[PDB]
Design a protein around this ligand. Sequence first.
Ligand SMILES: O=P(O)(O)O[C@@H]1[C@@H](OP(=O)(O)O)[C@H](OP(=O)(O)OP(=O)(O)O)[C@@H](OP(=O)(O)O)[C@H](OP(=O)(O)OP(=O)(O)O)[C@@H]1OP(=O)(O)O
Ligand SMILES: Nc1ncnc2c1ncn2[C@@H]1O[C@H](COP(=O)(O)OP(=O)(O)O)[C@@H](O)[C@H]1O
Ligand SMILES: [Mg+2]
Ligand SMILES: [Mg+2]
Ligand SMILES: [Mg+2]
Ligand SMILES: [Mg+2]
Ligand SMILES: [Mg+2]
Length: 318
Amino acid sequence: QIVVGICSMAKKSKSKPMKEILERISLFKYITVVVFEEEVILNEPVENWPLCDCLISFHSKGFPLDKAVAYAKLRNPFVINDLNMQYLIQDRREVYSILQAEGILLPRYAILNRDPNNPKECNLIEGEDHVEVNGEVFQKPFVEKPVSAEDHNVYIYYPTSAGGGSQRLFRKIGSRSSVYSPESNVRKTGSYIYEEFMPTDGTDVKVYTVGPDYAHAEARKSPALDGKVERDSEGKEVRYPVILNAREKLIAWKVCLAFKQTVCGFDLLRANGQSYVCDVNGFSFVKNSMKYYDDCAKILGNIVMRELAPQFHIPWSI
Ligand SMILES: O=P(O)(O)O[C@@H]1[C@@H](OP(=O)(O)O)[C@H](OP(=O)(O)OP(=O)(O)O)[C@@H](OP(=O)(O)O)[C@H](OP(=O)(O)OP(=O)(O)O)[C@@H]1OP(=O)(O)O
Ligand SMILES: Nc1ncnc2c1ncn2[C@@H]1O[C@H](COP(=O)(O)OP(=O)(O)O)[C@@H](O)[C@H]1O
Ligand SMILES: [Mg+2]
Ligand SMILES: [Mg+2]
Ligand SMILES: [Mg+2]
Ligand SMILES: [Mg+2]
Ligand SMILES: [Mg+2]
């Protein structure tokens, strides 16, 4: 048997989408799936972790990525989502740097790095209706994002002409994804990316790749619109149908390859007749799409077989 090891925090490994996909991969006659226990991941040395031939491992809050890297170096499995790239995906600055290097359209942006010790000595000038970051001018509306990609306190600043103030986004709490604040001035502590607001029809497009030649997309109400989450009867966020155009399919191909994450989620803003990437999340599955589960498992199984069937002397055809 070819062993596929799944290495992540239990919150992820035991999530319903993961279980749905893993039972389908387990359908491959020559593949056995082994899910690494969180207790083992956290508390055992990598030398004691289970063996695998193919490793699906991904960082989320609390995950010891240093251990995952050392395990991969020790055992040399075929790695589905590259582990070292997952350090970079945690830093919005690194993500945007990569997108630019790949000729991928993204919002015009500027980075404000702040020395916590001297927080006023950085390159920011603020007016009522604009900021200037390293000399670069952002008129309101603009977006302010923490440089840590794991910090979801993204703020949007409204122009005087629209009543000023700001929209404060956050990880969803029940029925809310954001709140309006009368505060008009930007945050005074922390490092931030400042970027142009891209006007959309009021939805985000979420893209989920499984390798460079497959991408599923769906839309949802922009969390900044008023912050009330649209929920269905099962308490799931309302998702709308999307089909990616030829340009967007190429974006997905580029993102998947550039970040070396076979399974990769990212966000598109359809604005001004083009599509801009504003966020790259790495490993992410679609929730509540049976067809996605079927396709994702099929593709991952095929990738595994294509790569490893020869060395195991197993017949494999495309
Ligand atoms: O906090 P994390 O980053 O470790 O996990 C979050 C991550 O899931 P992942 O592991 O990547 O599959 C989000 O997807 P993502 O990667 O596109 O992230 P971005 O926001 O673009 O960066 C997801 O938002 P969404 O895409 O479903 O709206 C969010 O669901 P949640 O707010 O609960 O949404 P509801 O289930 O209440 O509707 C998860 O929060 P928690 O599960 O509470 O931890
Ligand atoms: N430049 C932008 N223009 C318009 N809306 C944006 C822009 N950047 C982020 N947003 C909105 O804010 C939301 C959260 O920002 P995002 O970069 O995806 O951060 P997070 O990592 O917290 O998901 C996006 O889904 C989108 O609705
Ligand atoms: Mg099997
Ligand atoms: Mg949640
Ligand atoms: Mg991918
Ligand atoms: Mg996002
Ligand atoms: Mg993540």
